[PDB]
Structures are given as structure tokens and as C-alpha cells.
Ligand binder design. Sequence first.
Ligand code: NI
Ligand code: NI
Ligand code: NI
Ligand code: NI
Ligand SMILES: [O-]
Ligand SMILES: [O-]
Lengths: 122, 570, 570, 100, 100, 100
Amino acid sequence: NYIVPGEYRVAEGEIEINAGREKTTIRVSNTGDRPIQVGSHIHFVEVNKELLFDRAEGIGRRLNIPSGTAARFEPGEEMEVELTELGGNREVFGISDLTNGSVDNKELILQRAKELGYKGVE
Amino acid sequence: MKINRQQYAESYGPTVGDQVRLADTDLWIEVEKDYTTYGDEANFGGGKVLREGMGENGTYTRTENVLDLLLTNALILDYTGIYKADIGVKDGYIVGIGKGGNPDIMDGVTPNMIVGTATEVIAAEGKIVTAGGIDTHVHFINPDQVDVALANGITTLFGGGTGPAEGSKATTVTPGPWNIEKMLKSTEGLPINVGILGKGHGSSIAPIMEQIDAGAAGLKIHEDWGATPASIDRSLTVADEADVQVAIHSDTLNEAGFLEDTLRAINGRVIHSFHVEGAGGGHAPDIMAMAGHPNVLPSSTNPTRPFTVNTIDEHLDMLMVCHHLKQNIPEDVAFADSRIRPETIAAEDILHDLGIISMMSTDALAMGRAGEMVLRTWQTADKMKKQRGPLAEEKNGSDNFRAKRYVSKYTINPAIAQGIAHEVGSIEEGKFADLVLWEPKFFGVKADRVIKGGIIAYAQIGDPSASIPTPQPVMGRRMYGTVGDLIHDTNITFMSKSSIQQGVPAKLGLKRRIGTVKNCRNIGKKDMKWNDVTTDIDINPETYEVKVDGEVLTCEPVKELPMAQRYFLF
Amino acid sequence: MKINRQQYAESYGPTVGDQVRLADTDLWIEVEKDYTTYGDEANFGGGKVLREGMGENGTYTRTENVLDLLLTNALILDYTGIYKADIGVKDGYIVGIGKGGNPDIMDGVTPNMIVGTATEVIAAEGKIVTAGGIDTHVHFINPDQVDVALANGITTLFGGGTGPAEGSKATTVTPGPWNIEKMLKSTEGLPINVGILGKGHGSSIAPIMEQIDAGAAGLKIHEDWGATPASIDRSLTVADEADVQVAIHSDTLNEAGFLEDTLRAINGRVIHSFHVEGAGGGHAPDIMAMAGHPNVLPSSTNPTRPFTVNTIDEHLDMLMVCHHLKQNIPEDVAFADSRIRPETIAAEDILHDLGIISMMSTDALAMGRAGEMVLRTWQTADKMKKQRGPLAEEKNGSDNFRAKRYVSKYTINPAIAQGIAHEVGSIEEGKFADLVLWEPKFFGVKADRVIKGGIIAYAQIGDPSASIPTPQPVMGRRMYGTVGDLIHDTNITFMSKSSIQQGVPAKLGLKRRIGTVKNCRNIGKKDMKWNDVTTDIDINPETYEVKVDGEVLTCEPVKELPMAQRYFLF
Amino acid sequence: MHLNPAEKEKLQIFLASELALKRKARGLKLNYPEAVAIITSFIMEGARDGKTVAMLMEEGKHVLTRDDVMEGVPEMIDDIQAEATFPDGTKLVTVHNPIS
Amino acid sequence: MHLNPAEKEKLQIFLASELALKRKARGLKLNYPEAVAIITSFIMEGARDGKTVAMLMEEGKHVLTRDDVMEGVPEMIDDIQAEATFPDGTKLVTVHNPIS
Amino acid sequence: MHLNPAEKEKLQIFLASELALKRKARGLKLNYPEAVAIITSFIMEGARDGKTVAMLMEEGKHVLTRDDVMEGVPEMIDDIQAEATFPDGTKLVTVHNPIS
Ligand code: NI
Ligand code: NI
Ligand code: NI
Ligand code: NI
Ligand SMILES: [O-]
Ligand SMILES: [O-]
């Protein structure tokens, strides 16, 4: 009972993020020569062209990491990441303009990916 | 994946069950609930969540459910609860309390809390957010008092005065149509909400009533103008008709009557009893017995709050000096003795804790400190925890019950009393976006950011010439909310219905927001949130000892308080 | 009769061929020409020339070619030249540069530069006079920043913010119609010119476009809001349609693309590239390669300007603190390493000197210093003279070529980029009379007098209680240009054509002068005065080394700079 | 630091006191504002040291004597008031006739 | 003198530091603003003396120790930032956890 | 105290002088504002001590020498003016080329 002004006593336990959403692990490769860092809430299939991974597995998903954190890929680096399912309406607009609608248009998102040259459109 | 609860609280502010110490007091508040979706929290910055296509919706125009402003991860402390939520603001008003972000991709988004292109972001993770404080005992004496008030998280000033004139120095009164007009015009440049009180004195109705029509928001009866049976009665008659509140400082001298006479004159009408303990004025020595009646809305002023070792010497001295009282003259000494009373000051601490006194207020610059209403509320709560212990009603080791009772005293209860709680006084949807962010270490001591009408008006912030905002010296400063014409849109002038109906704003060219005073005459003690106790209060004529339920209410003064020498440079 | 050239320069300021040292730098500017008639110079005081019947015409009314204001004997430093002339001001605008006085009796009087009864006089003999500086990277964070800017001779602030909100603390953005309106109203009380930028983010046009219609003068794309392909594209589409500029801080993280992706999204449209070097943000590590393209208008922010021994430690630290970056976490350390780079900071000094980076700006209060844009421009020019020597193009031992190149970076070039150069940015006839007088010893350090719209707004001046204006303490102060309603007439709010056409000023009750943003979409690098170089810039992915024409651009940091410890009390 | 408005203001009392004490040390009889600055600053420093209002009320009457100050100064100063943070909060001190 | 706005402001840090040091000399444990004033003023004086940012970053962690200050103060101060003119221009110093 | 506007302002000269003298004592060559603060404050203190304008005009030329100040400073300061209350009212002092 030394007083730290404004201090927290946090209750016991752990917080599970993105609970009850399906999760998926995939390998991803920074085939570029510059570092790439990916935010918690970008639609995974829409990330930097030069990331090689199976683009299909990115669709309707984002990184299963704490909100507001990011995964880093140094140039040349390959590593596994875990994904979770997008929620709400499961629609994506803007970003890279690959979806602009329901994440269910798998066939369309992937076609746009292939034509613009996102690596890993399988 | 799971996040340990220490890291969680460190990144996002605390969640359900976490406790937080209020500054350096031994009061702890505990998160009762959390509106968030774990893993979908909102946050802003590089690689953060509020980015276009992600937690920020890129589709919707401002009208389509999008916010002007989102406060992310606020720990709200309010009469309505102590809990964790995003707060959404639009057009200067709180439109949503819940979970903000993008329904494209997030679960649980409150539907009118979309973060869109139009949306500004304030990070409140790790802050405590309260309603701005509402001080209903202000003397308009020195314009410098406004920043003093902002620095301690006060956002509404109700009271009266024309500046350092004797009448104003003694009473919260702006007398007569012309003075009220001049001050309404003055208010156009004060970056705080204001409501003005007319002189509650006269024996005909018209001289009083004309001040309500001129734009007063209420009246003050003060002994220095003659708190007689007549003035009390006419004022309440005016008030009942105009739907405004009346504040009273009664006849300390018992010249025209004793407390019971004042009550007969009041005759069951609604009235706000000022500095109810009596050090600040009133029927000697029993005024505080007012706080037991169902029709009295009881407030304390802050110099007596709480009962400390230096309290009595300071007050004895203040009074004697302030009244030009000589100590050779026995009537002066008898007067002082009958007025400054450890017996009632001690009890006032306890009546607060029992919810019998409903309200705090400052008495700024007449017998009280403009920037210390919030500060002294929490010092009182802390003293009481120390002396009386956890309230019967507490649970889980927190002070949430006591904290709600106390935060109510300077937020919702003054708003209800003044008939302005439709606009201000609490963090609730549909009310004006007067919000104060606190670092828990500075809680109740120095406000971090004061939001007025959805724009920051006041901030502790550093060197304006620096590369970032935090380099020294960090001091309180007016922000853009206060500059140019934005001062109009961020502040409310509260006025009587009749003056509004008569076009006083256009007559005078007021551009501030205009709020209606209303619903003051059909409330009572029972409407004071968390502080609704009525009871027979007996003050002993001989010994001045205060009984409630035939028990004497007494406590010790303390030699030391929290929220004091750890914080203050003088 | 002849006057020796030392006396001459002492009484009237220098003439053709004289050189003047810029503060304590080793830069010398030389008078290229002089509009005067030797023996007919203008001057004011007892027994002086501007007296009725003499150099002051006693016949003509104000409309008949007579000035409101004459600056006598200015040494102008501008992109258009370094030369000596009288400057005539009328209705807030520069109407004449030449020779003022009375054509009754004087030879060579510029015909619309008559000194008449209506004419005020400012003595500029022995001063250097420049255009006010135009800072196009301002965060509206703390209103105190304005005087900071005035003190260093800055007269226009372009940027965005609602005060110390996180969004505003990170980005030059005033988001959405309501915020933009509130700030436009705020601007009514800021004694500097202002233009506000909306949020350049969204995937539909309408959410972006509505901000231009609301009164934004431009947009800012910032990574913290998602600098994605979509936001870049919509913003440029809005910009092309509305005729406003777009500023970019790109995706440092390379999240959605690398530099080349950003360029594809830009697709050859005009864009202002912010803190092009990258320390202030952008594609790691190659952002600065932007400054080679013909469609990019490239600016630096000031914290990197110039490359000094304390630069890297200061920045490494700033960034790590500012991002809550822990040094135990290797991604934080890798992030910092990829972003703060001696290799690119060194090169940025040189790209400036080669005219490849066209513009300076502050980044006030987010990652840059509000009052040091001018200061740091000249420190950079001086370092470069020291390290690279007189530019190829110099003559007669002066630095006139380098000085024009550099003065352009904070005057004309930001005006051109922002589409406001019809109003401000240079000392030319027909432009608004924003002028800064400098004592050569304080040049670029502390402005003597800042003229806004033909009235002094800001001055270094002494004890207001004194018999004369010079007794201590001499400090920066707001002058009459800033007081009462004159603040309206002396400052410009710059707005989009569409918001002007839609009556936003009348809607909001703005009384400032309103300027039109225009001609932003049909310019390029080629239009940047003295700084129009395009070239392939290669940044090495491994070593970060900067090549232009297959030569590595590198230089040493310096331990000491001019315009520093000789001047500053802290 | 988080300086509030009163904190910024009261820096100026301390500063004036320091100027006044330097002037006393050079041997000058102190004038009205000097005298007031010294006693005021003393009160505030007393509070900071933890004295009681009662102590400072006694002590304040003996910080300066009539032979420290110009003729007339003692009679110009009837009382001096200052508020400062005591261990138990802000309190008001009044010193009556500080220079007797 | 030509005081700019930052110059006027930063006079107040020095002044508060002088007040704080006088209070330390009387033997008082220093409070939050006092502690902050002292370390800040130290940084600015360091810059004026010509030290490097790196030096002041090390040194600033040793101007006050927990036994100079009230309980809780060390934990209230996470970092202190000041900008001052070094020989090579204005630079920002951050001292993390100055009182350990 | 009844501080008028000039009184509040001139507190800042004294304060800057104290900062400058502390810096001189550490051994630093003084800069432009420092030098100006010291001489100005000296003049005002001279007036307060009762010297004549003539005295302060002579004396002000010898408060600092070129070896107290950075290169160029002597040449930046052509004159220093201050007004202060002499026994016979406010008067203006001008010191021409104070550092020779
Ligand atoms: Ni009263
Ligand atoms: Ni009162
Ligand atoms: Ni940026
Ligand atoms: Ni910026
Ligand atoms: O009162
Ligand atoms: O930036």
C-alpha cells in the first residue's frame, strides 16, 4: 500500500480475441526487397502484390492478432501467420479495389487479383 | 489467441472487473461492463484499425450514420454507471455510447456509430471520461475565473455578477434588465456555458419578473439584499410562473424570522438551498436542517469541503476580515462563533456521504474556489472512506457506489436543480457533448482535455513551438473551441422560456447556442440522483450538535488530504 | 556632390553591387538593381523628404494614383530578384514596386506610387523585405502555434486539425463537413491566412467530395487513415474535379503496395508529396524517389533540416516514443531502422541544393517546428555552401542564385502548389500585401515587422509603457492588424471554388477575405521556381544510398549551425 | 508540469520576492510592492513547508520591520492575503498589519 | 532581446526549477511539478552548455532520486521532454523514467 | 502588490538576467539576448538604487566586455534602452555600444 496515483488492479484472466471465429494458418512470403508490415484489419487478400501466399485463403479474412497491431515481413522473409474471419456484413470496399462488395465473390476477387498481379492467385 | 489482462489494460484501457485508483486517493472504481468486441476494439494511428476499408467505413456520407467524433475506449464515470465504451459525437451532441467502427467487417458496431471520412478521433483508452462539471454557485467577479474552472473540469457556470462590484462580490446576482443584458453580451466571449440569476428581491412581482423576461435563467435570494418573508415569497411566485430555479442564502441574523419562518414563506415550493451547512451563510445555527426537506435541493460550497485541521482558523479569519469584524467588539465575536461551527462542518462531511446533501458548487471568489469543486468532492469521498469505511452498499472491494453518489453531486444533480439536465450534466445519448478526459493519476485534480460541444476548448499541453505537443512547459491552455466564432457553437447560454419567446437573443445579437431552462418547479429531493434522502435533521441550539435518526453526526478533521501537495506548485 | 558608398548604404540601405550577410551565415546577397533616383530617395521624418509640397504630393485624393502605404528603400529578396525599391500598397495589395514620391518635383516616380495625404510610411532602408512564408504542412493542434509562426515570418497556414485530438495530432486533416465548418468559424479569430484540408480517404466519391463543398481548400492522404490505392485514387479524382491540391504521406509500412504501387494509383495526376525524405513518413526506405517525377510537387518538413550531429538520436528517439515503440521488441527496432536514415537525410540536404526538392514546410506540432521553416531553410543553404561551395551558377562572389532557389522553397513554390499564388507567395504587383521586414542581423531568425494585408500584424517591440517603442523588453507582439474587426480584412481564408459558389462564407457568417483555390491540377515540377529538376532517384534497398546520375549523394552532419545559440534564450 | 492558471500566476510573486530580497541585501529600504511580495511569498513557502494557518498568521507579522521599509509603507499595508496548498488542501491566510 | 513566444514561456520552467531547488535545499521531498521543473530546466541548461542529446538522455536519469521526491512521484513521471537550442539547432530530448 | 502592466513585463527582464548570470558563472560566453538582459536589468536596478541617468549611461558601458560574449554579439548590440522609476520618476536610459 505504497500509493501509485492512477494505478490499475486488473482482474485475473486472459482476454480471447476474435472468439468463435474460424481460424486459418497459411505461409506468406515477402518476395520484395523492402519490408512489409500488415495491419490487424486489412482484408488479407488485398495486401501488397509482392507477398506470395495462396490468395484464396486471404479472402474474407484478416490477421488474428490484437486490434491495432501489425505482422512484419522483412525482405525475403517467409513465415506462417494465423487468420481470422471478417465479421459484420462481411463486405469490403476500397483498399485495393479487389472486393468492393461481399467477400463471397471469391471467383471475381481472384480474377481481379490475377489481372493486377497479386502473387499467389493459384 | 489470448492477451494477458495487464497488457490488455495497457493497450486499450481497463475491462470488466479491472479497478483503477482515483488520483492519489484510496478510492477504486471498477469497470462494470464493456461495450467492446474483443479483437475488434477501435484505435487510431499508423497500422491501426481506423483506416479506410478497415475499421473506418469508406462508403457512407456524413448523414448516413457516420460520426463527427469518436472517443475510443473511454472508461466512463457517471451516475448512470462506471463502464467501458466508445463515445460517438455528432453536431456537438452525444449520439451514441457503445462500439464504434465499420459494420463492413466488424461485429457489434452500434449502428449510428460508424467511423467514416467525416470522423475525427480522440483516443480515450486509459483515460477516465466524465460529464463536464456544473457549478451553480458562481459569482461573476473576474473573467480569469473561467480558465480556473476549465482546468478543474467545470463546463457550466450558473450564478450572477457584473464583475468586482460589491453587490456581485457578495451575491450571485446580476440585477435588473440592463445588467442582465450587458452580461448576456459579455457571455458571448466566455468559453464556458453560462446561466445568469436575477435579484430574488422585492415586494411587487413586476420588478422581479422583468429580469426573467430580460433573459435571467433563475433568481438568487441573498440576505445581503434582505432575505425577508416578502422577497422569498415573490421570488418563488415568479419562479413557479416562469419555470426557473430559485437559490437561497437565508437570513443568518434571524432578523425577520428563524429557519421555520423561512420554510413557512417557502411554503413547500421548490428551492435550491445554497451552502446548506451555513458557513457560507444562513439561519444561525440551524440552516443545515433545510437538507432534510423534500422540497429543498441542498448544495454545499467548497471551502468547508472537507473538514480539515486548518478549516476553522481559516474560516473564522476569512469571515472576521470579509465583514470588517473587530475582535474587541463582543457582538462580532458572538456573530463569528454562531456562524463558523466545527459541529456542522463535521456533520456536512457525513450528510454528503449519506446522500443527504445532494450537490457541490464552488461559491467562486465570494467564499469558495472556482477551480476546486471537483477536487474537493473527491477529497470528501476519500476522507469518508477513511473514516466511515466502504459504504454498506459496496461490493467486490470497489468504491463504485460511493463514486456514483459523489460524481452526481457536481454533474447531474446541479443540472436537474437548474432545469438544464435535458442538455448537460451527464454522459447520455442526446445530451450536449461536454466531456472531460482525465489521466487517472490527475483524476479530479487537473483535466487533460475539456470538450465543449464536441470540440476541445481546454487542454494541458506543452510548448507550441515544439516538434510534438508534449515538451515542457505543459500547462492549461484554451484550444480552438474557444477561438473566433467557434466560441458561439461550443457554448450554451441558458435562458428563461419567456425571454427566448420574446426574442431576447435576436434583440441582443447573441450568437451562442441558446438553451431553455425548464422543469424546475416539479422536482424535489427525490429527484437528486444517488442523493435523494429526506430525514429530520436536528441541530442542537446550545451545543450545535447534529442528529439524524437520534444519532449525533460527528467526525475528526484530518491533518492531510490526497489531491494536494503531490500535485500543486503553490 | 558625391556620397561615399558606406554612408550611402548607412542612410538609405545598400545599392547596386553592395552585399549583405544573412544573419550569421556565410551567405551574401548582392543588390542586382535599384529603382531609385540618386538624390531623390524617399524617406520620412522631421526635415525629411516626404513632406507636403515636397516628396509628398498635396494635391491628389486617394483615388488619383496615391498609396495607402509606402515602404521606402526596401532590399527585396524574392524569386523574382534581389534588388532595391520602394514598395507601394493600396487596399491591402501591392500596387507598385519602383520609386515612390511626388511627380511635382521628382524624377522617376512610378506613376501609381504617389505619396499623398492618404499615405502611411514604413521605413525599410537597411531592412531586407520578403514575402510572408507559406507553410503547407500545418497541424491545427494548439492556437499558440500562430504567434510562433508569425515570429519566424510565416503568414499563411495550410493544413488541418480540430486541436489536440489524436487524428489531428497525427494528420493535417479536418474531417467531414461539420469539423471543417467549426474550424472555418475558428479561423475567424486566427491572425494568419488559413486553408483547411479534408480527409483524403474513402472508397466512394461523395464522402470525400462533400468536404470540398463544405469549404476545404485541399485534401491530405495519410497512412494513419489508410493510404491505400483506393483512397489515393478517389482523392485525386475529387481533386481533379474540384481544382484543389492533394498532399500525401504514403504507406510507410508498404502494407498495400510499395512506392511504385502508390505511383500507379497516382497515375500521373498532380500531387504534393509531404516530407519527401521519409523521416516524417512514407514508403520505407525509398519514398524520396517521389521527388524525381514531373507530376510530384516535393516538400520537406523541417526536423531533418539540415543534417546535424544530434539529428538521428533525436529522431530515433522521437519516433520510438511517438509510436509507443519498445526497444525489446525487434519489429519496433527494425521499423525505426527502416524509417530514420542518415543516408537519406544527408541526401535531402543535397536534393534541396540541386533544386530537386522544391519546398519546405514545418509539420508544426506533429513532427516539426511551427516557427522554424524559414530558419531551417537558410541553415540548409549555409551548410551546403560550406560543404559544396558556391553553386556553379553564382557570380561576383555573391550567393544570389542559391538565395533565390532557397527563398522560393517557403514562398512562391508552396503558393503555386496550393493553387493560391495569384494571391500570395511573392513580392509582385497585384498580390496581397503580406510582407516581412528583417534586420539583416536577425534575417530568417526573428522577424522585425510582419505586414498582413497592408497592416502590421506582428512586431518585435518593447515596453508599451515607455516614452518610445524600443526600451526593453523587446519581444514579439500582436499589433493592430490583429485586433477587433481588422483581423477580418488583414487575413484570407482560402476555400474551394465550389464552396465559394455555394455560399459557404455567408452560410457561416465568415467575414475574413475569401480566396479561391485554383490552378492546382495543371501544374508540375516544371512550375516550381528555381527548383524544377526532374531525374531518376535511386535509393539502394540494402544500404539506403541515394544516387542521382549514378553518383551517390552523401554529406557529413555538422556539429554547429548559424542562426542558433547566438540568438536564442533557450 | 500541468500548470493551472493560479500556478502560473503565483510564480510571479516568488519572482518579485527574489527581486525584493536582492534589493534588501544591497541595503535598500523596501517599497510597497516589494514588502508585499516578500511577505506573500513567505506565506506560500510556509504552507509548502507544512506550517499551519495559525503559525503563518503569527510568523507573517515578523518577516519585515518598519526599519526594513520606506516611510509610510507600514501604514499602507493593512493586511496581506494568500492562498496556497497546505498538506490538508488550499487554505487562505490573512496577516493583519504585517509591519508594525 | 527579441523574445519569441517559446522564449517567454520557457522562462517559467527555469523559474519553477529555482523555486523547486530552493525547496529541496530547505529539506522538502519534492512533488510532481517541482521534480518535472528541475529535470526539464536541467535539460535546457545542458543544451545551452553544449552537451549532446545522448548525454542529456543519460544524465537526465540521475538529476533526482526517489528519495528526493514524495511517494508516488517517481511513478507519475514516465518521461520528460524538452526542446532547446543546441549548437546545431533546436532538438528534442526525451528522458524516459527520469526517477528510478 | 497592484502590479501594472509594465511591472509584470519587466519581471521577465530580471528573470532572464538571473538566467544569464547563472550561465556566465558556469563559464559560458553569453549570447545576444543574455547580454541584453544583463545590461537592461543592471540599468533598472541602478535606477532603483538611486543612481542618475548620467551614472547609468557611463556604468552600462562596463557591465560586460567582448570576452564575456560570443563573437559578433558586441556588434549586434548598438544601444540598450530601459525605463525605470528613479527617485524623481520614470526616466529613459540609453546606453550606446554597451560592449566595446
Ligand atoms: Ni451565500
Ligand atoms: Ni455566494
Ligand atoms: Ni506526415
Ligand atoms: Ni504531418
Ligand atoms: O455565498
Ligand atoms: O507528418
